[PDB]
C-alpha cells in the first residue's frame, strides 16, 4: 500500500496491476488540492487546503461537483474508458484530483506529467469517469485527472469585484499549482507537465494557455475539439445572466454584492433547483434566439483574463509553448427551410446573424444534394462552427506567433476511447481500434515528453507550418494538409461582408 507525502499531509493510495505490465500502477483517488469551497468560499477563488496530521485514505473516488445528475450520469456512462460504471456522488466539496503513477515510489521518479481536464460544457462532468490507469501504464507517464467547479458554482459572474467569475478556471489553475508543489513525490516531473482535454476541457486548456497566471504551471498543451474561440463558452460579460439567476433563486438584484451575498445563503439543493429551472444544457427553439443567453461561461475578469481571448491571441504575447489542436468531424434529416431555421435558433450556440443564416445553409446544405437523408451536412457545418473553424483559427494564430503547433482530425469523446486506452480495461473491441489506441497515446505522450508527437513506429506527423500540415488519424493513419481551409475561408469572408454593412 503506497503512502506518499504531500505539502499538506500524507495520502494512502493503492496498487493496481494492469495485465500485460510488470510494474503495478500506484493510484490515489480523491486527493484534495484546495479547501472545500463552502459557505463564504462559494463564488470565490480556491483557497489552499488546511494541513492534516493523519494519513489520508485516497483510494475512493471523490464526489463530483454539483451538477445535473441526470445529464451527469449519462455523460459519465458515455465517456468512461473502463468497463465498470462508477457510483457517482455530487457535492460542492469536489476540489480533488486523481493520480495514476507508474513510477517506482521507492526511487526518484522524473516521469512527464499529463493533466487531463474533462469536458461537459462547464456544466457537467467529473475526473473519475476517466481512467489514466492505461495511459500511465502504456506510455510510462504520470496521469492526473482534475475536477473544477461547474455551472453557477463555477462561473457565476456579476461582471465586477463582488463576483468576478471563472471560479472553475481558477480551480484548474490551483490544481496545476498543486501538481507543481507535489507531483515530484509521485515520481512526476514538475518540469514537464502537459495539460490536455476535450470539448469544454479543450477550451479550458486554450484559456489556460492564454492566461497571465499560468506562467510555468505547464509546458505543453493539447486541445481536443475545443479551443478558446468557442463562442458558446465565452462572453465578455454575463451581468444580465447573473441577474436572471439571482431572481430565479428569489434574490433581489439591487446590487452585485447583495446578489452574491443572498446566493451564498442558498443551499446546494436550492441552487441545484435554480440550475434545473434555468435549463442551461438545451437549445430553446420558440421565441427570440437572442434572449436565451442561458449559458454560464468564461468571462473577462481582469485576473485569469485581462481582456477577451481573441485579442490576447492577437497580441501574441502569452505563454509560448507546444500546442496541439485537434478535431473529430462529429458532434455526436430535414429540408433547407427547417434546417436554415435550426441554425437561427442555434444562435446562442453559434452566433450566426439571421441575415446570414440562409447563406450558410444554401452553401453547406446548398443546392447540391436535395435529398433529406443527405442533410448530415448541416451537422458538418454546425461542427465547423463549434470547433472546426475556431480550432484552425487558434492554430494559425499560435503558428503565426512562432510557437510549435500541430493539428489532427480523428475519424467528441471517441478519441477519448483511444487517448485513455479504453480498448484494454473495457469490453474488448476490434483488435484494430485497440492498436489505434496505443498509437494515439503514443503521440500524446511523445508530445508530452518532447513537444513533438513523432516517434519510431508511428507515421510522420508534420509540424503545423504554412502548408497546414496535419495528421489524419483513423482506420488508416496518414498525413494531410490545409485542414478546414475551404470552410474557414467561406466563414471568415461571410462574416467579413458584414464588417461594414
Ligand atoms: C456575435 O456575432 C457578432 C457578429 O458576427 C460577433 O462579431 C464581433 O463583434 C465585434 C464587433 O466590434 C468584433 O470586435 C471588434 O472588431 C475587431 C474584431 O475583428 C477588433 O479589431 C476590434 O478591436 C480589437 O481591439 C484589440 C485591442 O487590444 C486589438 O488587439 C484587436 O486586434 C486584433 O484582434 C481582433 C479580435 O477580434 C482580431 O479579429 C484581429 O486579429 C485584430 O487585428 C482589435 O483591434 C473589436 O474587438 C469581434 O470580431 C466579434 N466579437 C467581439 C464583440 O469582439 C460577436 O463576437 C458575436 N458575439 C458572441 C456571442 O461571440
Ligand atoms: C481505506 O479505505 C477503504 C475503502 O474505503 C477501507 O476499506 C473498504 O474498502 C475495501 C475496498 O478497498 C473493501 O474491501 C472493504 O470491505 C471496505 N471496508 C469494510 C467496511 O469492510 C479501509 O478500511 C480504509 N483504510 C485503509 C488505510 O485501507
Ligand atoms: C466576425 C467573424 C467571426 N466572429 C464572429 C462571428 C460570430 N460570433 C463569434 C465569431 C467575430 C467577428
Q: By the 8 A CB rule, do 32 and 127 touch?
A: no
Distances (CA, A) of 170 to 91, 153, 154, 288: 18, 12, 9, 33
The CATH number, out of the four listed (3.90.320.10, 3.40.50.10860, 3.40.50.1820, 3.30.300.90), of the domain defined by the range 1-501: 3.40.50.1820
Q: Which residues touch 326 (CB under 8 Å, ≥6 apart)?
A: 222, 223, 224, 225, 391, 407, 408, 409, 410, 415
147: CA distance to ligand 3 center in Å? 31
- Phi then psi for 137, rounded to 5 degrees? -70, -45
Instruction: Give the Cα separation of 344 and 340 in Å (integer).
Output: 7
Residue 146 has, within 13 A of its CA and on its CB side, a CA count of 29
User: How many whole angstroms from 360 Cα to the centroid of ligand 3?
Assistant: 14
The partner residues of 112 in beta bridges, in order of sequence, read: 189
Is residue 231 in contact with ligand 3, taking CB distance under 6 Å? yes
For residue 358, CA distances in Å to 327, 343, 355 come to: 26, 9, 7
Do 37 and 44 form a contact (C-beta atoms < 8 A)?
yes
Nearest Cα neighbor of 67 from 147, 175, 162, 174 is 147
**HSE of 107, CA atoms in CB hemisphere, 13 A:** 9
**Which residues sit directly before a break in the chain (C to N > 2.5 Å)?**
332, 411
Cell of 262: 443572498
Alpha-carbon distance of 143 to 141, in angstroms, equals 6
17 is catalytic: no
> Which cell goes with 122?
462547464
CA distance 75 to 77: 5
What is the whole-number distance in angstroms between the Cα of residue 362 and the centre of ligand 2? 61
Helix, strand or coil for residue 96?
Answer: strand
| CA atoms of 471 and 54, how far apart (whole Å) | 49
> How far from 58 is each of 98, 334, 357, CA to CA, in Å?
9, 51, 52
Looking at all shown ligands, the one closest to residue 16's CA atom is 2
CA distances from 99 to 15, 23, 130, 233, 268 (A): 12, 16, 11, 28, 28
Resolution in angstroms comes to 2.5
Quickly tell me which residue has 468564461 as its cell: 298
Is 456 one of the annotated active-site residues of the chain? no
| Pocket mutation for ligand 3, best pick of 228, 231, 293, 309 (most atoms within 8 Å of C-beta) | 231
**Ligand lying closest to the C-alpha of residue 13:** 2
Please tell me the distance between residue 466's alpha carbon and the centre of ligand 3 in angstroms.
Answer: 23
* Contact between 139 and 159 (Cβ < 8 Å): no
In the numeric block, the cell 458538418 is attached to 380
Residue 70: count other Cβ atoms within 10 Å of its Cβ.
Answer: 10
Domain ranges of the chain: 1-501
Strand 142-146: give its sheet, edge to edge. 14-16, 25-32, 96-101, 142-146, 111-117, 188-198, 220-224, 323-328, 405-410, 470-473, 478-480
Spatial contact of 118 and 125, defined as CB atoms under 8 Å apart: yes
Grid cell in block for residue 83: 468497463
Count other Cβ atoms within 10 Å, centred on residue 330. Answer: 15
For residue 284, the CA-to-ligand 2 centroid distance in Å is 46
Nearest CA, atom 10, ligand 3: 231
Instruction: Determine which one of 199, 223, 391, 437 is catalytic.
Output: 199
Question: Cα–Cα distance between 281 and 278 in angstroms, integer?
Answer: 9
Which residue of 305, 311, 312, 313 sits with most ligand 1 atoms within 8 Å of its CB, as the best mutation to test the pocket?
A: 311
Distance CA 174, CA 95 (A): 10
Distance between CA atoms of 234 and 390, rounded to whole angstroms? Answer: 13
* 10 C-beta closer than 6 A to ligand 2: no
CA neighbor of 1 nearest in space, from 29, 26, 20? 26
Q: Best substitution site from 293, 393, 394, 495 to test ligand 3's pocket, by max atoms within 8 Å of Cβ?
A: 495
Task: Say if ligand 2 is within 6 A of residue 40 CB.
Answer: no
Q: For Cα atoms 490, 374, 223, give the angle at the middle one, nearest 5 degrees.
A: 50
Rounded Cα distance, 359 and 108, in Å = 60
Of the candidates 123, 82, 76, 125, the residue with the CA atom closest to the CA atom of residue 100 = 82
Judge whether 319 and 305 are in contact, CB under 8 Å. no
59 Cβ below 6 A of ligand 2: yes
The protein residue with its alpha carbon nearest to ligand 1, atom 39, reads: 310
Write out the three cell numbers for 243: 441577474
Specify the residue with its C-alpha closest to ligand 3, atom 7. Answer: 351
DSSP class per residue in 266-326: S-HHHHHHHHHHHT-SS---SS-TTS------B---SSS-SS-HHHHHHHT-S----EEEE
CA atoms of 357 and 341, how far apart (whole Å):
8
Q: Is residue 118 among the annotated active site residues?
A: no
How far from chain centre, in Å, is Cα 374?
Answer: 31
Residue 481: name the closest of 392, 355, 387 by CA: 392
Contact 146, 116 (CB under 8 A): yes
Amino acid at each position: 500500500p503506497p503512502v506518499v507525502d504531500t505539502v499538506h499531509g500524507k495520502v494512502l493510495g493503492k496498487f493496481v496491476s494492469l495485465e500485460g505490465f510488470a510494474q503495478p500502477v500506484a493510484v490515489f483517488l480523491g486527493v484534495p488540492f484546495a479547501k472545500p469551497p463552502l459557505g463564504s468560499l462559494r463564488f470565490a477563488p480556491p483557497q489552499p487546503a488546511e494541513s492534516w496530521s493523519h494519513v489520508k485514505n485516497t483510494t475512493s473516488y471523490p464526489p463530483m461537483c454539483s451538477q445535473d445528475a441526470v445529464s451527469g450520469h449519462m455523460l459519465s456512462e458515455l465517456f468512461t474508458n473502463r468497463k465498470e460504471n462508477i457510483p457517482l456522488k455530487f457535492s460542492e466539496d469536489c476540489l480533488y484530483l486523481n493520480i495514476y503513477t507508474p513510477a517506482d515510489l521507492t526511487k526518484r521518479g522524473r516521469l512527464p506529467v499529463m493533466v487531463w481536464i474533462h469536458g461537459g460544457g462547464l456544466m457537467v462532468g467529473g475526473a473519475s469517469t476517466y481512467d489514466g490507469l492505461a495511459l500511465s501504464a502504456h506510455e510510462n507517464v504520470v496521469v492526473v485527472t482534475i475536477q473544477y467547479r461547474l455551472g453557477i458554482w463555477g462561473f457565476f459572474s456579476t461582471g465586477d469585484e463582488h463576483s468576478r467569475g471563472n471560479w472553475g478556471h481558477l480551480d484548474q489553475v490551483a490544481a496545476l499549482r498543486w501538481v507543481q508543489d507535489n507531483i515530484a513525490n509521485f515520481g512526476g516531473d514538475p518540469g514537464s507537465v502537459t495539460i490536455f482535454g476535450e470539448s469544454a476541457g479543450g477550451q479550458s486548456v486554450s484559456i489556460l494557455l492564454l492566461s497571465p497566471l499560468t506562467k510555468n504551471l505547464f509546458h505543453r498543451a493539447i486541445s481536443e475539439s475545443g479551443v478558446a474561440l468557442l463562442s458558446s463558452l465565452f462572453r465578455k460579460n454575463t451581468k444580465s445572466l447573473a441577474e436572471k439567476i439571482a431572481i430565479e433563486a428569489g434574490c433581489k438584484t439591487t446590487t452585485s454584492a447583495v446578489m452574491v451575498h443572498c446566493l451564498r445563503q442558498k443551499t446546494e439543493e436550492e441552487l441545484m433547483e435554480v440550475t434545473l429551472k434555468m435549463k442551461f444544457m438545451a437549445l430553446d427553439l420558440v421565441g427570440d434566439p437572442k434572449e436565451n443567453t442561458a449559458f454560464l461561461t468564461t468571462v473577462i475578469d481582469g485576473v485569469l483574463l485581462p481582456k477577451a481571448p481573441a485579442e490576447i491571441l492577437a497580441e501574441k504575447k502569452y505563454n509560448m509553448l507546444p500546442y496541439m489542436v485537434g478535431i473529430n468531424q462529429q458532434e455526436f434529416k430535414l429540408d433547407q427551410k427547417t434546417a436554415t431555421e435550426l441554425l437561427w435558433k442555434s444562435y446562442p450556440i453559434v452566433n450566426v446573424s439571421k441575415e446570414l443564416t440562409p447563406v450558410a445553409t444554401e452553401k453547406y446544405l446548398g443546392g447540391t444534394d436535395d435529398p433529406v437523408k443527405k442533410k448530415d451536412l448541416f451537422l458538418d457545418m454546425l461542427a465547423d462552427l463549434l470547433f472546426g473553424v475556431p480550432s484552425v483559427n487558434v492554430a494559425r494564430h499560435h503558428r503565426d506567433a512562432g510557437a510549435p503547433t500541430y493539428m489532427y482530425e480523428y475519424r467528441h469523446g471517441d478519441e477519448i476511447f483511444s487517448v485513455l486506452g479504453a480498448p484494454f480495461l473495457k469490453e474488448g473491441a476490434t483488435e484494430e481500434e485497440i492498436k489505434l489506441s496505443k498509437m494515439v497515446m503514443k503521440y500524446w505522450a511523445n508530445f508530452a515528453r518532447n513537444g513533438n508527437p513523432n516517434g519510431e513506429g508511428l507515421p510522420q506527423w508534420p509540424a503545423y507550418d504554412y502548408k497546414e500540415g496535419y495528421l489524419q488519424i483513423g482506420a488508416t493513419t496518414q498525413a494531410a494538409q490545409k485542414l478546414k481551409d475551404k470552410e474557414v475561408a467561406f466563414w471568415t469572408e461571410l462574416w467579413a461582408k458584414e464588417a461594414a454593412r
